[PDB]
Amino acid sequence: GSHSMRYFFTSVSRPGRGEPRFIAVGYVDDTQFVRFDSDAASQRMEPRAPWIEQEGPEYWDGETRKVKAHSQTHRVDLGTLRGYYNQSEAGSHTVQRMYGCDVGSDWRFLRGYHQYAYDGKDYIALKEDLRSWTAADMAAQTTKHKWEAAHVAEQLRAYLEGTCVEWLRRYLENGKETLQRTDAPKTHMTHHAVSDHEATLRCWALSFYPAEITLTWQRDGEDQTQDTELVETRPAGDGTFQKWAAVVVPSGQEQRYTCHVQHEGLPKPLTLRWE
């Protein structure tokens, strides 16, 4: 199928409590593969997947160099933004950046992104054409102009369409066993008598990868969206995901209800029924 590479950066100012916190993480699809944490002792980019571990010293030295330079840019940016919004030097503030690329099933470029947020709200983002910017407010229209005048989009376009996709391909080949796998969900239902005249039916999907999945309940084939309790898909910790959907069903109507499971790993979508 399609694949993605994404880097996520968070910088948090800590006035009077030292230098800002900086954390960087990199993912291929739903698998993390690198991290950097300003507060950790190593002060290096570190592997978080076994398939990147064997990359050489050139790789780690270079990623360390670059991630430190990212850190320093963000440190400057926190000051800049504080000034733009006329904010005091006492408070903690957050900048977040994400960039990366999507490829299709043929591993050819599909889309690039580069997005920036300040205190949890959009600040500026590269538009889909990778040539122009979306400034979320008046302050950001100024960054938009500056970055237009400095041809920043062109720098990013080159990376997103070239470098990014080339590296994503390399990671996919080397992490083939982990990354190019699908683990179809293992499914089961639980039944709990809420009372003498209702039971909760809970449909489980466990140990699946990638994270994208759809679980729905039907009654006599009619979708029960408004009556379904769904939880957010959650990591198991071993690189797979879990999710469940529940309905509360009346007396002896268990057979009317069906749970439907859609996942890239399944040859056909599953239709599950208590009996």
């Binding site: 670059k66 991630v67 330079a69 990212h70 840019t73 400057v76 940016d77």
Partner: peptide, 9 residues
Amino acid sequence: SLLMWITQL
């Protein structure tokens, strides 16, 4: 692999 640099605001 990361961008070679990111430009400041």
